[PDB]
Amino acid sequence: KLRIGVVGLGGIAQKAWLPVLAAASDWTLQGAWSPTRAKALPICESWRIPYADSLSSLAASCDAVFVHSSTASHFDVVSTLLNAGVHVCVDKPLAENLRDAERLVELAARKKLTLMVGFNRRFAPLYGELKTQLATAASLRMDKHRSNSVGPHDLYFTLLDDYLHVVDTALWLSGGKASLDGGTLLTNDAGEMLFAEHHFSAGPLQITTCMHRRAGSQRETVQAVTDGALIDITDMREWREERGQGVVHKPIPGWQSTLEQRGFVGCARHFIECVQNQTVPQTAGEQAVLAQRIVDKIWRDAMSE
Amino acid sequence: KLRIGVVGLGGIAQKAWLPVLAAASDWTLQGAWSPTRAKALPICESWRIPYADSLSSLAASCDAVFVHSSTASHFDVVSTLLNAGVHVCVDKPLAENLRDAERLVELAARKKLTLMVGFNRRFAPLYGELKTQLATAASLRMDKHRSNSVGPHDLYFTLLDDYLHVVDTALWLSGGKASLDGGTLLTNDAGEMLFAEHHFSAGPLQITTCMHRRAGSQRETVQAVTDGALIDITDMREWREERGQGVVHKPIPGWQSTLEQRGFVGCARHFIECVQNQTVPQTAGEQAVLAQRIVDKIWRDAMS
Amino acid sequence: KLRIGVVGLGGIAQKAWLPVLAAASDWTLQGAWSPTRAKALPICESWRIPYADSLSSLAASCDAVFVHSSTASHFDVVSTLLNAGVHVCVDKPLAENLRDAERLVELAARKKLTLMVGFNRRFAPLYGELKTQLATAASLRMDKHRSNSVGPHDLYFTLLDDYLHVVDTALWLSGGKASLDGGTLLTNDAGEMLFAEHHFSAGPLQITTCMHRRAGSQRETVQAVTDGALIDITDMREWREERGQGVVHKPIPGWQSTLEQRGFVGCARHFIECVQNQTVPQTAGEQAVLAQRIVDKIWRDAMSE
Amino acid sequence: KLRIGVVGLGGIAQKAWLPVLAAASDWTLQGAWSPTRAKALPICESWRIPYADSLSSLAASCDAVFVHSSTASHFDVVSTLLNAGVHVCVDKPLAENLRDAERLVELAARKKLTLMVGFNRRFAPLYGELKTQLATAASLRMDKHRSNSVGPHDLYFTLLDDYLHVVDTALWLSGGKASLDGGTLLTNDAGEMLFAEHHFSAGPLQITTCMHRRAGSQRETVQAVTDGALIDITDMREWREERGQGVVHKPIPGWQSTLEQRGFVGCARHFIECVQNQTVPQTAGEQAVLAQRIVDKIWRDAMS
C-alpha cells in the first residue's frame, strides 16, 4: 500500500483536501508538511497525523504527495519532490509561469514519475455525467462568480488562480479543441481583476467562460443547450434538465459529501490508481498546461492594448 | 377615443392582441380583416367585430390599425394603410426586406403618421424593470428556445419572425450601442434553422443572443451579471436576484396577466398614446429597424 | 344558442368572471346587471355589453345567469332569477344561511331549473388531474393564506367567504366522505378571523385544511402523499411530483390564461352544457350545500365554548 | 481533553459520527466496539481506532462513549457503560422499552454521569434558527418520507428508529407542551409500517407529524405558518421564508457540511461540553424520553 504525503497548510485543505484523506483503503496518509511550521502543527495534532519538519523528510518517507500550498510555491515544491523521485499531484496552477510548467512536465517524464494537476472539476460526478451528453451540444456557458472578492493580487494572479478553473472545465467539456474568438478583461484602478468573459468555438458549438469578482453572490453554473435537451448545473450539486416532458431535478444521493461533489475524491483516487497501474493521468503532460496556455494567450493581449 | 382596427386573425391575434383591443375604455374596436377571409367571418362574430372585406374598407372606417399577418404581406398592407391616413402598429418585422422597411418609415414621416413596430418585449414590466439595473452590467445573455419547432419556414423567416425578438430585446436592454462580434448559424439539409448564437460588445459589457429550435424546452430567459448583483428573469414572469444576502423572488400580484407581463397591453397603450399625443413611439424610425439591420447582415454573411 | 346574463359589479368579475365571457361560441352574452348602477356602467360600455337597468329586465331577456355579486345578496338574486324561470350559477356561497340555501335548492328543482354553485376550483385542470391520482393517498393538506387581509367582517362571514373554498376543494378531492376530527379557530379582539385549520379523516386518508389571514404571503397550495408519489401544487399553476426518479415540474401550456388555470372557464362551460343537455351540474343539490354544512358545524362549536 | 469512545460501526457511524469524532482538537478518539466484531477490525484500522474486544475494555479506556447500535442492545450497553463511570451519548431510542429508558436515566442521576440522547436534529442550525421565529406560530408540519423503504423491521422498530425523529423535533420546535389529538397508522399484511400521521395541539398552534415509507421521495421538510411570515425548510439545508415582499432563500456558506447542517457536529460538541462543564444536556432526563413516551402510547393504542 502506497504512503501519501500532503503539502498544504490548512486554509482550504483542512476543509476538503484533508477530510478527503479520512478514507484510507489501498493507501496510507504518511504525514504532511507546510511552509508555515506554525498554523499547521495544530491540524496535524487534531487529525492525529505525522508533521514533517521539512519538505526534505516528508518527501523522504513518501511515495507520492498532494501539493496544495501557495501557487507561488508550487514550482519549487513540485520541483523538489520530483527530484526526490516522488509522485506528485499539484493544485490547479502547475507553476505561475508557462515555461516553468513545461519544465516540470519534462522533469516528471524524464524521471519516470507521474505529475498531474489537480483539476478536481474534471472529476465531479455531475460534470462527467454532462460530458457524456454534449454530443449534440450547440451552446456551453460556465459562470463562476464571487460575492465580493476583488483579490489583493493583480490580474495575472487571479487569472491563473481562478479563471483557469473555468477555462479548464469548459474546454474539457467541449472535447478540448476550441478557439478563442473573443472576450473581455475588466480591472479596477488597482489593476485587480473585476470581470472576465470569453467566447470559444469548437466547430459549431459556442463556448462561454464567465467570471465576476463582485457579483454579490458566490455561484457556479454550467448551462448546456444540446439537440433534444436543455441542461443546467448549479454548484456541482444541482442538476436540472428539460427533454420536452417538463423540468427534471436529478436526485441528490442522500449521503454524499460536498468533497465528493466537487470532484476532490475522484481526483485523489484517479491519482492513486495511476501510480500503481503506472498509467498516464487524465491531467498530465499536455493536459496539464493546456488551459494555462490559453489563459496566457489572453493576458498577453489584454496587456498590450 | 380613436377607432381601432385589426389585421390578421391568426393565432396570436386571437390569443394576444384581440383580448387587449376588446376591453378598452379609451378606444373602440371597429373592424378586422384577414388576407384569407376564411373562417374570418366566424372569428369576427366571436368578437363582435364588423368584418372588412377590404383593407381600404377597414381603413376608411378606422383611425389606427394593428397589423399582424404573414411577414411578406406587411409591406403591401402597411404602405396601403399609410396611404389612407391611418396610424399603424406593425408586427415585429416592419417589412420582409430591409429597404422596404425603411421605405414605410419614410412614407410615414412624410404622411405625418405614427408608425411603430410592435415589440411587446420592450414593454414587459420585468424587462423594463431590468433595463434600469444594468447601469453596471458586465454580462447579459438572452435565451429563447423551442422544444421541437423546426417548422416549415426557412432560416430567413425564423431570423425575422423569432430570433429578431432576442436580438432587439438584448440590444434595447443594453443601452443600444452594441457591435456584432461573432457567432454561428445551424440548419438541417432542408435549410430550416436549427440553432443560432451571437456575441455583441457595448464597451466592457458582453451580450449574448441564443436560440435553438429543438432543445426540449420552450423556455425564455434573461441573465444579468452586474456589479453587486445577479438577476435572472424566466418567461417574463419570474424575477430572481442575488445581492449578497440570498436569492429573492420578486412577488407576482393578481396583476398576473400573461398579456400584461409579456408587454402586449403596454405596447397597445403606448401606440395609441403616441397617436393621440402626437409623439414619437419607442419603436419608430431607426428604432423600428435597428435589430433587423443586424439580423439581415447575419443572414447575408451566412449566404456568402 | 343560449343567452347569458351576468350579475356582479366588477370588483373581481372584471378580472376573471368577465374576460371569461370574451369567448362566445354556442352561447351569447345577453347583457349584465349589478346593484351599484354606477361602478358598472363603465365596464358595460368599455366591454361593449348591454346594461340591464334592473334585475327584472336582465332576467326577462336571458335563459341563464352567472351571479357574482355580494354574498349577502346571493339569496335574493338567485331567488328572483329562479322565479323568473332562469338558470343560475351562484358564486361560492349559495346563501349566507344554511336553511336559505336548502330552500333555493328546493325551489330550483321544484321549478325544473338548474341551480349550481360556482366552485371554480373543482374545474381547475391541475386539481382535476390530481383527483385521478389520489387513489392511494394517505395525506392531503391544502393551504390558502392572505398576506394581510384581516377582513372587516366577522368570523362567520370569512368562514363562508373564504374557508368554504378550502373545505370544498379538500372534500371533493378526497371523494367527499370525510369526518371532522378536530381543528382550531383563532380570532383577534375584533372577533375577526385570524386563523383556521381543521383535520378530516376519510378512512385512513388524513385531510387538512388550513388558512391564515396574516401570513405575510398570498399563497395557495395542495400537498398529496400517496403510495408511490409525492405531489405538490402551487397556485393552481405549478405542479411538482416525485415518483422516485427526481422532482418533476409538469410543463405549463405556453398560451394558457390564469382564468383557465383557476377553473373559471371549465366551470362556465360545464354550466352552459348542463343547461342544454339538461343534466344535473357537478355542484348542484347536495353538492351545493355540502361543505357549507361542515363550515356551519364548526362555527356552531367555536361559538359555544 | 476527554477520551472519546464509539460503539457500533454500522453505516451511520462511519458516515456521520466517526467523521465528527475524528477531526477533534478538544478530545481524542481512543477506541471502538461493535457487537459483531466482523469487519470491525478493518473498519477501526481505516480510522486508526484501537479496536476494543469488549465493552468493559473500551470503557476502561474512555471517558465518554457515543453509542449507536441495534436499538435492542442499547439498554444492556448503556447500563453497563454507566456502571463503569463513563458518560454516554445514546442514539435516538434511549432504550427499546420505556421503563428501561427511565431506568438508565435514573441510573445516570445516581451515578452522577452525563447521559443524553443524540437527537441531532435539535442541533441543526436551521431548525434551531426556526425555533426562534415560531413565537407567533399557528401551524407547524414536519414531513419525512422514503421512496420505497418498507424495510424488514416492523412498525415498532420504525416508530422508534425513524418516526421518533419527527415527533421529537416537532414537539421541541413548538415549545414542548403539545397534546396528541389524533392520527392514523397503516401497515401491510406483514405488519411493516407504511404510513403514519398525527396531530398535536399546544394552544392555538396545530402540529402535524407525517411519514410515509413509500412516497417516491426521500424528502424531509418543515412548514411554519406564523403571523407575518411563512417559513419552509427542506432537508435541513434549504431555508425559504415569505414576509410580504417575496420569497427569500437564506444563503448557504462554505460551511456547507452535511454533518453540520444535520446537527451531528453540534450534538457532539454539546455532549462533551456538558461533560466537561458538568451541566445538564438539552437531551437528558425527561427530555430524553418525552417523544418516546408519546410514540409508545400511539403504538400501544394501535395494538388495542
Curated annotation (Swiss-Prot), chains B, D:
Keyword Transmembrane annotated:
no
Against InterPro entries, the record matches this protein to: Gfo/Idh/MocA-like_OxRdtase_N, Gfo/Idh/MocA_oxidoreduct, NAD(P)-bd_dom_sf, YceM-like_C
Q: Name one GO molecular function term.
A: oxidoreductase activity
Q: Recorded E.C. number(s)?
A: 1.-.-.-
Per the record's keyword annotation, is Plastid included, yes or no? no
Question: What family does the Swiss-Prot or TrEMBL record give for this protein?
Answer: Belongs to the Gfo/Idh/MocA family.
Query: What PANTHER family does UniProt report for this protein, alphabetically?
Result: CONSERVED EXPRESSED OXIDOREDUCTASE (EUROFUNG), OXIDOREDUCTASE YCEM-RELATED
Q: What is this protein called?
A: Putative oxidoreductase YceM
The species is Escherichia coli (strain K12)
Q: What is the lineage of its organism?
A: Bacteria, Pseudomonadati, Pseudomonadota, Gammaproteobacteria, Enterobacterales
Name the gene.
yceM
